[PDB]
Amino acid sequence: PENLVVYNDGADQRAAEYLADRLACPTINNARKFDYSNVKNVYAVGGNKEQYTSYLTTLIAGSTRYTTMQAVLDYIKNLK
Amino acid sequence: PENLVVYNDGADQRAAEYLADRLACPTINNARKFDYSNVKNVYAVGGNKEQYTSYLTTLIAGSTRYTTMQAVLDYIKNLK
Amino acid sequence: PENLVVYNDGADQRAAEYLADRLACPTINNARKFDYSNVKNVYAVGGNKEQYTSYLTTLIAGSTRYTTMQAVLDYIKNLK
Amino acid sequence: PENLVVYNDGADQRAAEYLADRLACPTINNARKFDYSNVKNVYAVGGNKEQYTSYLTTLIAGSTRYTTMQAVLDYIKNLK
């Protein structure tokens, strides 16, 4: 209900756990059927918006697994 | 606010993700400072109760990483 | 060249890391193009044999992610 | 015997798996007692050299989990 990070099976879970560390919050596998309606900030890591809940707040993703990870690190480093 | 699974760095994350799959819920690393007061069911996987929040509901843990995993599988298999 | 554990993206990596702990060996993601010809024992965790190298020695897999994990634990517990 | 990536429990495994993807090779947990003498290139991700085998070839590590990950991405991106 404050922050949640969602990811799909595979390399993107890696990036998601780094984001979850910085935000001090939980992660969730997108394959798990879940009620996102009461989560304040829903972050998605990797892929496209259509894969995720319509309650998504922020998508962090690049062209590859490596650039998705770079995008997360950029996001983490530039938080104020 | 329904279910959350907490784990410590290492092998226990493995067991936690299996439990989170069965419960269709998020996981959280115990190193992340987090407010557990509004979570209905807090599950902890591995270790002892003193490592975790006082809002803990269910600890699933054995003597080793392998028996902790066995305990989680037992828990999953026997849910009705 | 003694032991190697191979897995596919997702839950099966979890089981593979438990097996790799017991065998004190490396793991490899099956998506990585790799030369298996010089590995003495090739273990695969989850799925079917057709997914993996023809140098496969032992497949440990069940009907589900949970029973694949059970099969690995059985294998670990019963080693002499 | 060509490439192997070693890591310690925790966040550094994340970076190690990205490196292993790029190099198409296995990963190994540093807690596993292992014979590194016949591996051509031994990569370590995170921490200091004293934690790892003396057969280590390349250490990729920063001041934090996040900068260790950045260092791996830099390494991956700049390979020719």
Author numbering:
A (entry chain A), B (entry chain A), C (entry chain A), D (entry chain A): 195 to 274
Which sentences from the paper describe this structure?
Endolysins are produced by many double stranded DNA bacteriophages to effect the release of new virions from an infected cell by degrading the bacterial cell wall.
We then transferred the critical mutation that affected CD27L cleavage, involving the stem of the linker of the C-terminal domain of CTP1L (V195P). The SDS-PAGE analysis of purified recombinant CTP1L shows a reduction in cleavage for the V195P mutant. After 2 weeks, crystals appeared, an X-ray data set was collected to 2.1 Ångstrom and the structure of the C-terminal domain was solved by molecular replacement using the C-terminal domain of CD27L as a search model. The C-terminal domain is truncated at Pro195, and there is only one molecule present in the asymmetric unit. The head-on dimer is also present in the crystal lattice of the C-terminal domain of CTP1L.
